[PDB]
Design a binder for these strands. Structure first.
Ligand SMILES: [Ca+2]
Lengths: 219, 219
DNA sequence: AAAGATATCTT
DNA sequence: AAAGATATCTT
């Protein structure tokens, strides 16, 4: 199935998971930083081709936001079913150590979940699912080697800013918590658990309605 | 000087190279997106190498933040001058047309500028200069087709999410405005004018004290 | 155009 | 706890 194939395609990365930098059409290459702001974008860009591929294989049309600051990242809907649109958002968090308690921010709770068309590509009601692709990596110190350019003949010499990269696909309500993920940016917080817990689905809400009904009243 | 040497190296690097994607150690490339979220990250990572070199060239030690939410992007100082540090932060904004007015967010005004050690690598009083490197691009088609991955043998093929990228270096206070660039995130807003005005530094503040004084009593 | 989104982290 | 930083945009 779509969902079963996507989660599997993500596991296989593309070629392989070892993104080392941004390349120029001139053939020059630049390293990557360690901060999440950097890997966040990278992961999101890393997922674009994989998604569009699986979606294509399952007769799905993908639509990214036209205007920035709009949710979600990917909208999968079929020509004949302009009623059941799928949403996929890429979330990423870091970890200082290995296999420890992590937590993601799952988007504000004062936007589309409260105003059917606030900050969202398509009207909320037109979506039946909300899949969250979460990425978890272990931070790494940006070595001095990361501050120099490389040529194509050295891709395997470009030091990586991360380590144990783990990915997962899961429904938003299934992995959401009861605590906010941010203050001034009123974000929904997920559960504070281990990577496995997200893959499994050990959450707190026993249904979508419960989730929506909890965060639409969060104060 | 270090400053003119920097801006010149930045002009060069921008004209002699065009970033087009993220490459893997396996030789796999993934196109970029046409949103400020992705580009600001690609521009930041694009500047690091140049900055580090020109720094070492003029006898300067470079230091990046240890925390994802610490300013500035780059800290330079001479070993025999630890209390005369220089702060370089990269900002990015987009345009829809050609010579079109723009405005940047120049960092918050309720942190390190009001609390000497709040959200900043080194104490505020230690920095004797705060430089801003501004990158301006123009949104494009954003693939709308190029959602696939490429290989090293197709660089010239990979489409670009930007059109007219221009960069400039200028003191934060010199291009600073009197209007907030952010609401909840209480960021300082620059002047709203053309690229040229930023280079020529046609700000509204006469000196840096006028700048600080204004944004420290801002509400 | 003040206020509040989009993502995520730190105190 | 929460409250509010990091950067940029939309309304
Ligand atoms: Ca997102």
């Amino acid at each position: 199935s779509l969902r079963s194939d996507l989660i599997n395609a993500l596991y296989d990365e593309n070629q392989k998971y070892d993104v080392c930098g941004i390349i120029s059409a001139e053939g020059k290459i630049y390293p990557l930083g360690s901060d999440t702001k950097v890997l966040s974008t990278i992961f999101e860009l890393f997922s674009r081709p994989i998604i569009n591929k699986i979606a294509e294989k399952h007769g799905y049309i993908v639509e990214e936001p036209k205007q920035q600051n709009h949710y979600p990242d990917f909208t999968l809907y079929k020509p004949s079913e302009p009623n059941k649109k799928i949403a996929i958002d890429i979330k990423t968090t870091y970890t200082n150590k290995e296999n420890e308690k992590i937590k993601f921010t799952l988007g504000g709770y004062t936007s589309f979940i409260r105003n059917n068309t606030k900050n969202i590509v398509y009207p909320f009601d037109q979506y039946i699912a909300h899949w969250i692709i979460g990425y978890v990596y272990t931070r790494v110190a940006t070595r001095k080697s990361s501050l120099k350019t490389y040529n194509i003949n050295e891709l395997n010499e470009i030091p990586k800013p991360y380590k144990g990269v783990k990915v997962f696909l899961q429904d938003k309500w299934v992995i959401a918590g009861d605590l906010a993920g941010s203050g001034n940016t009123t974000n929904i917080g997920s559960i504070h658990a281990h990577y496995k817990d997200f893959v499994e689905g050990k959450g707190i809400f026993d249904s979508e309605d419960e989730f929506l009904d909890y965060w639409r009243n969060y104060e």
